[PDB]
Write a protein that binds this ligand. Structure first.
Ligand SMILES: Nc1nc2c(ncn2[C@@H]2O[C@H](COP(=O)(O)OP(=O)(O)O)[C@@H](O)[C@H]2O)c(=O)[nH]1
Lengths: 117, 90, 81, 90, 160, 285
């Protein structure tokens, strides 16, 4: 069970949440299994609206949105579309100041394999 | 709070004083009486009867005929309160 | 890019270290030499407790010299052969 | 014989301008909504049972000599001084 | 009073080949001032560049305003509730990566007063990158431009 | 194609061309009609797609209706693609009860004699015009909309632009004549149309006062000028804004100020509609 493997390895040594949610709120829930709150639907709605908005720029399709907040609340996301053409899947993860700038790219590196398969 | 759109009776396929979208108002059936009033009521509210259900409108919009809005001092493109009242009270 | 940082990065690259890689804790700031075909994301995602490490890929033959202090990482690219 | 080509041109430029617009009404806070599909989650475990890639960051550690360590700790300090010696005006 | 020629001269010195356009706009997409790498000589070459910069600022202000209503700060750093009470955070940096460019949106924390020359809309610094651009140099340029614009806009409220 | 303003004597045609045309519109006189051979009527009526007959509401109109019926028969025997419109005129002095009864009487008197003649295939429209109001501009706009073969494409473009951008009402005016080429599917309010007509007056007058440097250079402008864009915010939670589309066209939209907080997205959709209009009206193969 690779889900329990990453559920021990990406919730312990860097302390980040992981959401692999989508448009219709099929919640791949909190990987430390904390309280869910209302930040998931807000972040997923903002990411889908930002992925809709940034297609109209000249630079092309977005790969990632690295949204750094103050005093160590830095959030990175990667949005990828569904294979059956029914929407998009985001990959939300929240960390500290230097916790994102570091081993969080490992967590999104496993999460993009998850969103592929 | 819903946006107030005006239409013309007999124009564009609309033959009623009130056009109610069923996907905006799922609790409104045929023959109901709909109270349309201003926020912070200055004038009398408007009561109209539902005679058709068309899905051409967008969300949070209710279509009233232009002369009915001109009689009741309803400004177009404004917020209105949409409520359903019993026929025995009015 | 400043001129003194550009000449310092040119002083980083030589006939021994064929590639220079300057990077913050998460974001790159300066590149020199042959920095392509991965070998940059593994420097960006790198984090460890100690300060002096030597790393090479087990599916490649490129050896990287890595130092990290004051939230700034320097990477030197040279072939393991 | 030439008006139909003009109509096809107007249809394809109408499709281009339809695809190039921005839906402002979809670009709002549709949150605080109830859940829709909380059951379809077993696809996550049956796809991520193994899928041949659960692999840690590799960076296979050899031990540094003191010459290269001294070289890189001398270089990183003056590069850090170059970073904090930056200025907007030249 | 704000002088846009002063802002253009302040942002002209932070422009390299990998950073074509640096602009300052509001959260509603209203552009204040902008620069460019190459200065156009034709009129239409200025007009299409100004239209592109205005469209970039118009999309980037709404892309910042979508994320400004979300507080992810309680969902990290498990500690006491006084620390959570100290976590009244506002967004100050946003980096978006594309195939053929990069975009950085940073909110300029204007000094002087909380109601000096903005009606609850912070000025946003937009930095446009390319494929060869590096995101860490853009953050250094963003913090230098923010700390210079804030000192430049500290003398606001000009009289008569 | 040309527009022919027919009618009888003292019907109001010269006042219509004083108000509209004088701030191809041709005014045939109230006498020497199609029975007279003073003009080559069959040559002119082939090239004319819109026929407008002006009928006075206050005066007796049965001789005017007979002249209109024989003119309709003449132009149908000349060409089957002509559009016929009836301009009921001089309704400024009439009451609100009088206009509806006059329109009902004129329409019932006309549409039954159309079946009595037998030319039921042709469409004949009816308009209530007055030179002291803006209804003559709206009636001439609905006349002009029939002649343009590109009306449903522009109307569908304005419909999807109003639905996407939360724009309440949109018009595509011509700034020289204050006649709107296209509008959306929602009805045209007279209170909206008056302020949309005077918005062009304010813009053109201020741009005539202050647009003196460059602008009207005889050789060429060394720098290409910006398109004229304006924004007016009102006190009743409504915003009017114009964007210059072509050298003679403009787009005035009515938007709530709640929806004008996201004015950048509306500006982007206005730019995309500008690209669509400039690609439609460009010469092509
Ligand atoms: N008060 C008023 N007078 C009108 C109106 N329409 C037309 N008239 C008058 O009626 C006259 C009609 O003249 P007209 O038929 O246009 O002259 P013609 O074109 O040479 O045959 C004009 O001189 C106007 O003064 C109206 O709406 N109100």
């Amino acid at each position: 069970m690779s889900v329990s493997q990453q559920l021990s390895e990406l919730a312990s040594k860097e302390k980040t949440v992981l959401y692999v949610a989508d448009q219709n709120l099929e919640e791949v829930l909190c990987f430390p299994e904390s309280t869910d709150r209302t930040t998931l639907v807000q972040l997923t709605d903002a990411c889908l609206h930002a992925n809709e908005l940034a297609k109209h720029l000249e630079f092309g399709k977005p790969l990632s949105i690295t949204n750094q907040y103050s005093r160590g609340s830095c959030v990175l996301q990667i949005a990828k579309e569904k294979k059956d053409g029914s929407g998009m899947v985001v990959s939300t993860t929240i960390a500290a100041h230097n916790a994102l700038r570091g081993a969080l790219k490992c967590s999104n590196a496993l999460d993009q394999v998850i969103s592929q398969l | 709070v819903y946006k107030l759109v005006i239409h013309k009776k007999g124009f564009g396929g609309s033959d009623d004083e009130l056009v109610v979208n069923p996907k905006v108002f799922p609790h409104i059936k045929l023959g109901d009486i709909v109270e349309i009033a201003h926020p912070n009521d200055e004038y009398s509210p408007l009561l109209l009867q539902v005679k058709s259900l068309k899905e051409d409108l967008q969300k949070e919009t209710i279509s009233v005929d232009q002369t009915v809005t001109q009689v009741f001092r309803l400004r177009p493109y404004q917020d209105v309160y949409v409520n359903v009242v019993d026929p025995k009270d009015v | 890019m400043d001129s003194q940082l550009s000449e310092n990065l040119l002083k980083c690259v030589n006939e021994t270290y064929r590639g220079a890689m300057l990077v913050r804790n998460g974001l790159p700031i300066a590149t020199a030499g042959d920095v392509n075909a991965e070998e940059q994301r593994v420097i960006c995602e790198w984090n460890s407790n100690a300060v002096s490490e030597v790393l090479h890929l087990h599916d490649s033959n490129t050896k990287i010299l890595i130092a990290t202090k004051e939230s700034c990482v320097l990477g030197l690219i040279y072939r393991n052969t | 014989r030439k008006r139909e080509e003009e109509e096809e041109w107007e249809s394809k430029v109408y499709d281009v301008a339809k695809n190039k617009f921005i839906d402002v009404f979809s670009l709002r806070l549709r949150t605080e909504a109830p859940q829709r599909d909380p059951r379809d989650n077993i696809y996550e475990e049956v796809l991520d049972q193994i899928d041949s890639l659960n692999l840690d960051p590799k960076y296979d550690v050899a031990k540094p000599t003191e010459q290269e360590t001294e070289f890189i700790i001398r270089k990183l300090g003056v590069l850090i001084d170059d970073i904090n010696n930056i200025k907007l005006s030249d | 009073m704000i002088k846009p020629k002063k802002l253009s001269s302040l942002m002209k010195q932070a422009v390299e080949e990998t950073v074509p356009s640096i602009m300052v706009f509001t959260t509603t997409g209203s552009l204040l001032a902008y620069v460019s790498f190459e200065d156009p000589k034709d009129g239409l070459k200025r007009l299409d560049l100004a239209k592109r910069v205005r469209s970039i600022a118009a999309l980037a202000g709404n892309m910042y305003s979508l994320y400004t209503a979300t507080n992810p700060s309680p969902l990290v750093a498990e500690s006491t509730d006084d620390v959570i009470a100290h976590q009244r955070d506002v967004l100050f940096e946003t980096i978006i990566e594309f195939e053929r460019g990069k975009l950085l949106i940073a909110a300029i924390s204007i000094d002087g007063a909380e109601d000096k020359l903005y009606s609850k809309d912070p000025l946003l610094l937009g930095i446009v990158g390319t494929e060869n651009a590096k995101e860490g140099m853009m953050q250094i340029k963003s913090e230098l431009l923010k700390e210079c614009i804030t000192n430049e806009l500290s003398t606001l409220g000009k009289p008569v | 194609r040309k527009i022919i303003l027919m009618g009888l004597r003292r019907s109001g045609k010269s006042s219509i061309q004083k108000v509209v045309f004088y701030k191809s519109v041709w005014d045939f006189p109230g006498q020497v009609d199609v029975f007279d051979a003073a003009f080559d009527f069959e040559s002119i009526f082939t090239q004319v797609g819109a026929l407008i007959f002006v009928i006075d509401a206050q005066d007796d109109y049965l001789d005017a209706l007979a002249r209109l019926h024989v003119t309709v028969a003449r132009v149908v025997t000349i060409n089957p693609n002509i559009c016929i419109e009836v301009f009921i005129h001089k309704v400024d002095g009439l009451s609100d009860e009088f206009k509806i009864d006059t329109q009902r009487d004129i329409q019932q008197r006309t549409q039954d004699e159309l079946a009595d003649i037998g030319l039921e295939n042709v469409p004949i429209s009816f308009h209530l015009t007055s030179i002291f109001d803006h209804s003559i501009f709206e009636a001439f706009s609905r006349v002009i909309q029939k002649l343009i073969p590109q009306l449903p494409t522009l109307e569908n473009l304005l419909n999807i632009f109003c639905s996407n951008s939360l724009v309440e009402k949109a018009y595509l005016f011509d700034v020289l004549s204050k006649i709107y080429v296209a509008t959306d599917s929602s009805p045209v309010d007279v209170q909206s149309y008056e302020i949309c007509s005077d918005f062009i007056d304010v813009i053109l007058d201020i741009g005539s006062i202050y647009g003196r440097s460059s602008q009207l250079k005889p050789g060429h402008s060394p720098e290409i000028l910006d398109e004229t864009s304006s924004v007016i915010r009102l006190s009743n939670d409504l915003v009017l804004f114009l964007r210059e589309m072509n050298q003679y066209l403009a787009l005035i939209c009515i938007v709530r100020a709640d929806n004008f907080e996201k004015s950048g997205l509306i500006e982007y959709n206005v730019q995309c509609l500008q690209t669509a209009i400039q690609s439609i009206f460009s010469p092509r193969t």
